[PDB]
Every structure is written in C-alpha cells, then in structure tokens.
Design a protein around this ligand. Structure first.
Ligand SMILES: O=c1ccn([C@@H]2O[C@H](COP(=O)(O)OP(=O)(O)O)[C@@H](O)[C@H]2O)c(=O)[nH]1
Ligand SMILES: [Mn+2]
Ligand SMILES: [Mn+2]
Length: 278
C-alpha cells in the first residue's frame, strides 16, 4: 500500500495535513476509505476498543457510547468492545450489529475521579498483555463521555495514533496546557512540543499502545513518589510520551469535536463529539 493510494492531503489545503516527521494528519476529504476497507479486509484485521465506565459514568454515557460505536466504528470489519466497569450489574447490554462483539470486565473503582482516569493506563496495559495482543491488530482507547456521530473507520489506523485536541489545534505550542513543572515526569519545557493531543482517544497496534500506557503509567507513579501530580493527569503524560515518541498518524479534531466551540470551517464532518461542556 502506498501513501498516495489512500491519502490526498491537497484536498484540505487550509489545515495541517502532515507533520515534519511525515505523519499524516487525517482530515475529512483527504482519505479514501474504500481503498483501505478493501486493503484491510484482505488482511482480515480485527480492531479493539477499550472504554471505562465507573460510577455515574455508566448510566450517563456508556449506552450512548456503545450504541453509536456499534453503528460507526470500523464498519465492515470485526470489532471487539472491551468494557471496563466497576459494577457489571449496571451494564447496559445493547444489541450489537454484524462484526461487533464485546467483553466486559469488572474493575475496582478508584476514589478520586483523577485517579480513575489515570489508572486506565495501568489497566489497559494489563489487558493488552493478557489478551488484547492476541485478539486484535489495532486498538483504540477512548473516553466514554463522547458519542460517534459518523463513520470512524480504517482511515484512522496506524502503528501509533494520536488525537488533536479540539481547542488547541491552531494554537502556538507555548500556549499548550502541557505540564510545565520540571519536577513532573510529564514536563515539557516552553519552546518545545508539536501539538496538544487529547487523551480522550489514542491507539495503534497492541505493542505500541502497550508502550504508550506503560510509559504513561510509569510517569504517573513517579510523580506520585515525588509528591506531585501532572496538571492534566494522564493527558499531560500522554503528551509527553507523544513528544518523545512521535505518533505515526494523527486524527484531525473532526474525530473528537467539542460542539461547544461551535462549528468552524475546518470541521467538515464530525465523526465524534464530546458529551460535556468544560
Ligand atoms: O468518575 C469517573 C471519572 C473518569 N472515568 C473514565 O475516565 C475518563 C476520563 O474522565 P473524564 O472524561 O471525565 O475527563 P474529561 O474529559 O472531562 O476531561 C471517562 O471518559 C471515563 O471513561 C469514569 O469512568 N468515571
Ligand atoms: Mn472525557
Ligand atoms: Mn482535554
């Protein structure tokens, strides 16, 4: 497969379509999903998706997340939803369509919501080693408080995939909300940084996602031993990781849009939107 076979960056000339390290930034209009659908079908790939729903997040977001994912996520390819909840009896078991199946795991609920978010890195890694590495070719790790609005397909696959955060995709790096304290493992000094990635979505092959989660959690543990906590928790760490280990593919803000920003010219077709105003 060649880059030209599926990627046409010139189709969206008003936005960044490729990074300095040659990672394509996938925007609506630049990808050929039909070509990729056929390419991946022939390889018989399976894609996984992890999602955590602890406490009130179960009834507030889980059903809406899964229902939309069933309809829009990697349509036409085998998909396995890995659902981590603290109360399985609470599990809305909706009806899944062709090529969709799931697996539910009961996890321990952390007390602080910040710890719930950060502990996902630990848990995801454990599950990748234990079973995901043997079940899928690519995996996406997502926040539950969002909904798929349109096709989110194979055009998003890659070794390591990062998501451009909706509010800062056009901002100058020094304005990014990176962890700015050198005592933290997530530290990124002013004058450095490529983009501000959203921890709500990231993925790639099981091996790469394992590294992303293992390193982010290591960083999280280190800060805890140094009596400090990154400004934006797992997201600060994720951004530090992607700075040191450049993602091979980046998804435009259309793949994780905040409607509270409105809908500017650059956002042509939203594939997923946030649930909350922050
Ligand atoms: O009480 C909580 C806090 C967090 N989470 C999980 O971790 C994610 C990150 O939390 P959150 O979405 O709240 O962060 P935000 O996007 O607002 O920044 C959620 O999407 C959930 O999957 C959860 O299940 N229950
Ligand atoms: Mn969220
Ligand atoms: Mn954010």
């Amino acid at each position: 497969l060649k880059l030209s076979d599926w990627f046409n960056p010139f189709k969206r000339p008003e936005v960044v379509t490729m990074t300095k390290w040659k990672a394509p930034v996938v925007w609506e209009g630049t990808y050929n999903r039909a070509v990729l659908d056929n390419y991946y079908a022939k390889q018989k790939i399976t894609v996984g998706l992890t999602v955590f729903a602890v406490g009130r997040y179960i009834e507030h977001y889980l059903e809406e997340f899964l229902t939309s994912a069933n309809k829009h996520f990697m349509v036409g390819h085998p998909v396995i939803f890995y659902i981590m909840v603290d109360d399985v009896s609470r599990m809305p078991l909706i009806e899944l369509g062709p090529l969709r199946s799931f697996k539910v795991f009961k996890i321990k609920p952390e007390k602080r919501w910040q710890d719930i978010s950060m502990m996902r890195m630990k848990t995801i890694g454990e599950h990748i080693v234990a079973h995901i590495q043997h079940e899928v070719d690519f995996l996406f790790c997502m926040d539950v408080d969002q909904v798929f609005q349109d096709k989110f397909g194979v055009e998003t696959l890659g070794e390591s995939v990062a998501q451009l955060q909706a509010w800062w995709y056009k901002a100058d790096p020094n304005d990014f909300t990176y962890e700015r304290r050198k005592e933290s493992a997530a530290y990124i000094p002013f004058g450095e940084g490529d983009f501000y990635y959203h921890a709500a979505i990231f993925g790639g092959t099981p091996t790469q996602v394992l590294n992303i989660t293992q390193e982010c959690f290591k960083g999280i543990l280190k800060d805890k031993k140094n009596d400090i906590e990154a400004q934006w928790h797992d997201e600060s760490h994720l951004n530090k990781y992607f700075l040191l280990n450049k993602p091979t593919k980046i998804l435009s803000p259309e793949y994780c849009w905040d409607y509270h920003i409105g809908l500017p010219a650059d956002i042509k077709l939203v594939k997923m939107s946030w649930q909350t105003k922050e």
